Amino acid sequence: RALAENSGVKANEVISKLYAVHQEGNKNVGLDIEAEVPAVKDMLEAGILD
Amino acid sequence: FGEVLEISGKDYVQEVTKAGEGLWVILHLYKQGIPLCALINQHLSGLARKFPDVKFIKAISTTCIPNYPDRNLPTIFVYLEGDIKAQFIGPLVFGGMNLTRDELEWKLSESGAIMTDLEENPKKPIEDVLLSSVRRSVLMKR
Amino acid sequence: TGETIRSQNVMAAASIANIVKSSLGPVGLDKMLVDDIGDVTITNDGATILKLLEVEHPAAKVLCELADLQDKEVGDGTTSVVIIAAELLKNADELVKQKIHPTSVISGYRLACKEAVRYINENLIVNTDELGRDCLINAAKTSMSSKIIGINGDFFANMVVDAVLAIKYTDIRGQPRYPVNSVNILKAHGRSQMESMLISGYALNCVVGSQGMPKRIVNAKIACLDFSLQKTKMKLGVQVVITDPEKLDQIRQRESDITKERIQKILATGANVILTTGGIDDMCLKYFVEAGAMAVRRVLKRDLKRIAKASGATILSTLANLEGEETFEAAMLGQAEEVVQERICDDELILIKNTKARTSASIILRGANDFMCDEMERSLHDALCVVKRVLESKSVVPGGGAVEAALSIYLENYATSMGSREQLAIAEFARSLLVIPNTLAVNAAQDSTDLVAKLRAFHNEAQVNPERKNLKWIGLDLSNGKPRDNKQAGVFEPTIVKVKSLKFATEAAITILRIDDLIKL
Amino acid sequence: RKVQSGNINAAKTIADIIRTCLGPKSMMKMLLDPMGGIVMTNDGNAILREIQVQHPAAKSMIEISRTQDEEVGDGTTSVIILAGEMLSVAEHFLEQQMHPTVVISAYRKALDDMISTLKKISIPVDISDSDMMLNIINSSITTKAISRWSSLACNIALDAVKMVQFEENGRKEIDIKKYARVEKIPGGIIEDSCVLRGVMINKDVTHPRMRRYIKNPRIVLLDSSLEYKKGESQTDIEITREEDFTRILQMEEEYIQQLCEDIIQLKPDVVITEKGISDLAQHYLMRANITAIRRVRKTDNNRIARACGARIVSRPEELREDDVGTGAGLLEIKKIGDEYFTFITDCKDPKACTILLRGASKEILSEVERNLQDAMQVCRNVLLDPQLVPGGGASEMAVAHALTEKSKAMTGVEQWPYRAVAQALEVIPRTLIQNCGASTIRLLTSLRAKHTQENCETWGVNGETGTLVDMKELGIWEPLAVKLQTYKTAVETAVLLLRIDDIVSGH
Numbered sequence A: 001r002a003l004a005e006n007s008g009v010k011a012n013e014v015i016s017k018l019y020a021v022h023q024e025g026n027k028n029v030g031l032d033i034e035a036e037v038p039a040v041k042d043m044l045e046a047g048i049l050d
Numbered sequence B: 001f002g003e004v005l006e007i008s009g010k011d012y013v014q015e016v017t018k019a020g021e022g023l024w025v026i027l028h029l030y031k032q033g034i035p036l037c038a039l040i041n042q043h044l045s046g047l048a049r050k051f052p053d054v055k056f057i058k059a060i061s062t063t064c065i066p067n068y069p070d071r072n073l074p075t076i077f078v079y080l081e082g083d084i085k086a087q088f089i090g091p092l093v094f095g096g097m098n099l100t101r102d103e104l105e106w107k108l109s110e111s112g113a114i115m116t117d118l119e120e121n122p123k124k125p126i127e128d129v130l131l132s133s134v135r136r137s138v139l140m141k142r
Numbered sequence C: 001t002g003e004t005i006r007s008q009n010v011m012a013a014a015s016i017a018n019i020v021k022s023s024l025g026p027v028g029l030d031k032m033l034v035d036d037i038g039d040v041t042i043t044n045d046g047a048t049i050l051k052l053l054e055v056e057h058p059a060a061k062v063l064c065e066l067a068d069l070q071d072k073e074v075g076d077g078t079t080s081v082v083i084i085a086a087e088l089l090k091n092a093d094e095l096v097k098q099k100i101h102p103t104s105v106i107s108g109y110r111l112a113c114k115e116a117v118r119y120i121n122e123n124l125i126v127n128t129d130e131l132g133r134d135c136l137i138n139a140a141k142t143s144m145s146s147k148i149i150g151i152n153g154d155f156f157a158n159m160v161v162d163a164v165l166a167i168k169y170t171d172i173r174g175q176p177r178y179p180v181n182s183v184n185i186l187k188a189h190g191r192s193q194m195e196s197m198l199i200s201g202y203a204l205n206c207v208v209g210s211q212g213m214p215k216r217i218v219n220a221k222i223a224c225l226d227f228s229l230q231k232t233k234m235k236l237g238v239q240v241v242i243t244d245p246e247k248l249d250q251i252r253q254r255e256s257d258i259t260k261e262r263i264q265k266i267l268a269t270g271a272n273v274i275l276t277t278g279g280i281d282d283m284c285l286k287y288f289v290e291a292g293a294m295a296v297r298r299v300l301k302r303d304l305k306r307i308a309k310a311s312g313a314t315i316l317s318t319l320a321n322l323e324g325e326e327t328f329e330a331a332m333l334g335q336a337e338e339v340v341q342e343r344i345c346d347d348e349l350i351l352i353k354n355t356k357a358r359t360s361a362s363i364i365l366r367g368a369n370d371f372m373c374d375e376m377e378r379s380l381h382d383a384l385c386v387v388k389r390v391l392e393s394k395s396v397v398p399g400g401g402a403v404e405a406a407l408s409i410y411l412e413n414y415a416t417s418m419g420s421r422e423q424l425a426i427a428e429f430a431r432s433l434l435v436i437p438n439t440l441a442v443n444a445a446q447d448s449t450d451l452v453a454k455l456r457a458f459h460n461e462a463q464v465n466p467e468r469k470n471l472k473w474i475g476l477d478l479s480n481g482k483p484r485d486n487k488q489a490g491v492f493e494p495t496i497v498k499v500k501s502l503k504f505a506t507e508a509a510i511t512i513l514r515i516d517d518l519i520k521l
Numbered sequence D: 001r002k003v004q005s006g007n008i009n010a011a012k013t014i015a016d017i018i019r020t021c022l023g024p025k026s027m028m029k030m031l032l033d034p035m036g037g038i039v040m041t042n043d044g045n046a047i048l049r050e051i052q053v054q055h056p057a058a059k060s061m062i063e064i065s066r067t068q069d070e071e072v073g074d075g076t077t078s079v080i081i082l083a084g085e086m087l088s089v090a091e092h093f094l095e096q097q098m099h100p101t102v103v104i105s106a107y108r109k110a111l112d113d114m115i116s117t118l119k120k121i122s123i124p125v126d127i128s129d130s131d132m133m134l135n136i137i138n139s140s141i142t143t144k145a146i147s148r149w150s151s152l153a154c155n156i157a158l159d160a161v162k163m164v165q166f167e168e169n170g171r172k173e174i175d176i177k178k179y180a181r182v183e184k185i186p187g188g189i190i191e192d193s194c195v196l197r198g199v200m201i202n203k204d205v206t207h208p209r210m211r212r213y214i215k216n217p218r219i220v221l222l223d224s225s226l227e228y229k230k231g232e233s234q235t236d237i238e239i240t241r242e243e244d245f246t247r248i249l250q251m252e253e254e255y256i257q258q259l260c261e262d263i264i265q266l267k268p269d270v271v272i273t274e275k276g277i278s279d280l281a282q283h284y285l286m287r288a289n290i291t292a293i294r295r296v297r298k299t300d301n302n303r304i305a306r307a308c309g310a311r312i313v314s315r316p317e318e319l320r321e322d323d324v325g326t327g328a329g330l331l332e333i334k335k336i337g338d339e340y341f342t343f344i345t346d347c348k349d350p351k352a353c354t355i356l357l358r359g360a361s362k363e364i365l366s367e368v369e370r371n372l373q374d375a376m377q378v379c380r381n382v383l384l385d386p387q388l389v390p391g392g393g394a395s396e397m398a399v400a401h402a403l404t405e406k407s408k409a410m411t412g413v414e415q416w417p418y419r420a421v422a423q424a425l426e427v428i429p430r431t432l433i434q435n436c437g438a439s440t441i442r443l444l445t446s447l448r449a450k451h452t453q454e455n456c457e458t459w460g461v462n463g464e465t466g467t468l469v470d471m472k473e474l475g476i477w478e479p480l481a482v483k484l485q486t487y488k489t490a491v492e493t494a495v496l497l498l499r500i501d502d503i504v505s506g507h
């Protein structure tokens, strides 16, 4: 929610999209404009780990 | 007749000193910004179109009693051309915004003696709990 | 003074224009109005709110007067004019404050309106029917609210188009008139909703309590009667001065012996069944059944009026009172072709085949909720209004908010190509035109900033590359926030209404801008 | 977005007044008077009628509750509580982003799901026997009333309900309000109440001279157009002198003479008259082989308009040959008691029987009146739909569980308002537990853990102890149409209060 509210769009639709795809655990909202509303990206092949 | 009419000061001071006999007159006041005045005016206009036997007067508060206080609410003055017997002072005797023609014709009881069996239940009160219970217990045991 | 009163008038006009702003289109909230008495009225109409509202400003008063004058002659389009005038005023306020003579911006607005009218008049549609009223699959689904049934809507659309295209009317001798509108309805309960039939000739009221007519032969022509004979008084026509106690018991036989010649003259040539309302006796029918003349009961005033206005057989030309000893003419004789009582929906109603002048279709509903009578009625009303408005006038425009963008682009291009003193006025007039799509997108709970941008980007391609003029005219949608082509399934609108609305808005803006001061001079 | 908040604030304020007045163990309110009076009562209707508010939403809710109480008669208290709870759980939590669009669709879907769940849980019943109906009536009427002569009263009410129905034609229309009244006469034993034809006649018939006795004639009533008028439509004759007055008597003779050759073929009797009584004209009228009565009030008018079917129109003479008066009707003026009583039996429009009770003072009158009223209301609410639902707090839990399961299975976007409106149905059990005097959290948790096993939807909370008991052993059942009407009214009120934009003034 804090990551989606500090970008430019809302956070309810992002949460609904993240909860509606699948329980894979490798999906997260991006940073570009083409990744705010869909928020369907695979961060495993990009290189974003913690 | 059967309809209200705007009155002035000369006609009022003439009707006061006229002193007739069996002529019924009902005068009312008027105030701006109060929906109760318009409601009672509509009620009187609807009632006057059924019993053409009593004169109605719709006076303005700025024409009578120039030095009026704050508690000078528009009331109803029923006169017998120089007789005083009913002075409905205070809107608490009615109910407020829940007023109808039956309550008006029951509170009047002087401009058309018909009595449509309204004296048996003019207004439904609030029945008590303890008083009614003890009354029923006294009546049943004796 | 000078500018302060003008700013106050502009602020008042902008404040009075924000009340009917959240009520444009079919999707809108309701508004409550109190008469300072105790009664509240809930309505969401653009005209009822403006009609029932108190005013105290001269500019607001003249604006309401102009709106009423426009609505007295134009059907719809009385809400967007106020918003257009408010936007024009709020855009010209900055121009006036930027040290510009109001005459210059007035002339610029006039030139922009003239150019817009000239560009609009060159973009119309010549054809009135496209593959049977927009393929008869798209012109009926958008004009019908489908909330409980929509799987078998194709059959309903086919029935509607067949009822509205087959029957026509012509009476002005100059243009085809609108077809039938007050068609007969029959609300049924507990029937097969997956099956419907269409028959010709409307039926009258159901005869209940007097169905003792052995109808076994095919008739031809019928008649009609407004009054009804009776031994005693009951309706109008009975005299009150003649006092005869020993004559009321034999007045029925005398009336029958008098009307025997009329009954024989009716039975001659070709007429049998007569139409008599309630108030007749049973002895006359039993006495006339031996010759071949009968009478159908259960006749109301609505059926009599429909019969008089359909076939044209009037009765007032000859009969007017209870005196049945009038002349025998063909005016009070219902010239028909075939009157039979077939077995439909387990009932026996009057079925008139091959009706002169008009030929209505019996629309019988199915067993469902009582709200079905208001489902197809609005669609039929919209269809007849469309076919009666676009017939004599071929000046229609597709879509609802797909023309303002092109108009603004053309006005901006004209202002850029002009290069005179009236350059910023045309630009402001073009900018003050995107207030309807934005409001429609806001009221639809969508993003207007992206929708208007996409619409402008799609409309700029049609003007940059001249390829066609009929296609590439997409607009907005009501179901979702996606651009849809308003041509294959859109609803056209009369262009004369929009032209008159724009002219009235421009005139109101000019009149308001021409007002200097309101001080008592 | 401040008008909706101010509206729901007043809605919750109004709803949080008669909240502790539900169930057998209810509290009592007290209202003071500005003059110096105090009245204690436990009826929410009196408090709602005596209150005076200034917000339009409160007045609209009061009018809706009054209409619901006048149309049905049972279930006009929980509607406001449910509406306030739904408002406080939906608008006061899901309006931070301002989106009043999908909430209406969510409410409609929730209402449809609740209707489907309540329809797919009902059980059939039979109306052949009479003991089961009497037992159901006695179980539903055991609220806050006396118990001494309730069986006979309920049996008489059931008989009157089963006898007053005659307007059947496919729609099943039942009218007992303006079709069956109540009569009272003191004197005699109190154990003789039954049903009779019922004629509103006390001291209206006046016969100064002694004539023949009425056995079984054929009375055909006419109209009321023989008063102090000027004629039919012209002012040719008037009542201004003493001589010309008796001239009207001659005309009165004609007023019957032509009738002797009109539709008068069964020889009627009394006629309705509003004005016209004397010591000389009445004698001639009685000698003219006809009788006339006077003194007609509103009750007699309603009786002749419902039972006989008398209309009001400007047509006294020359009517239909077979209008009214079809059948042998006896009219013997009995001397039972102390007043004149008429028993018009076997005439036009049957199945219009009234009650006959002989009590004592006014307390007996009031108690039998309220008993008949509540028994007839219960019988009408039961016979309207032969479907019973186990109440007490068992169907709401199952409905909420089904709604939660459907919301979890659909996996939609607007699931939050759906869950909020589904979890806002456990207000009645919580109020019952609070009124009983126990823990409202542990009992609710136990009920939720019990209403999720296998085949368990009739376990409610006892309204007298405070424990979970099965409804199959107690006997608490409710009708089906009342719950559906309550839910529909609550949904309509929520939709109306949620679609309020701005409020202005006008004329």
Ligand SMILES: Nc1ncnc2c1ncn2[C@@H]1O[C@H](COP(=O)(O)OP(=O)(O)O)[C@@H](O)[C@H]1O
Pocket (backbone or CB within 6 Å): C023, C024, C025, C026, C045, C046, C047, C075, C076, C077, C078, C079, C080, C142, C399, C400, C401, C476, C477, C478
């Ligand atoms: N199906 C639709 N698609 C797009 N726009 C629509 C549709 N239906 C109605 N509208 C828009 O809704 C508006 C309704 O305006 P209306 O309330 O009739 O104005 P007025 O109140 O002045 O008559 C129209 O301007 C039209 O553009």
Ligand SMILES: Nc1ncnc2c1ncn2[C@@H]1O[C@H](COP(=O)(O)OP(=O)(O)O)[C@@H](O)[C@H]1O
Pocket (backbone or CB within 6 Å): D021, D022, D023, D024, D074, D075, D076, D077, D078, D391, D392, D393, D460, D461, D462, D463, D464, D476
């Ligand atoms: N013996 C009982 N066991 C369980 N529940 C009961 C019992 N008696 C009454 N109740 C509950 O108390 C409630 C009383 O509601 P009531 O005050 O009559 O509503 P209203 O005021 O709308 O008529 C009923 O809904 C019923 O479920």
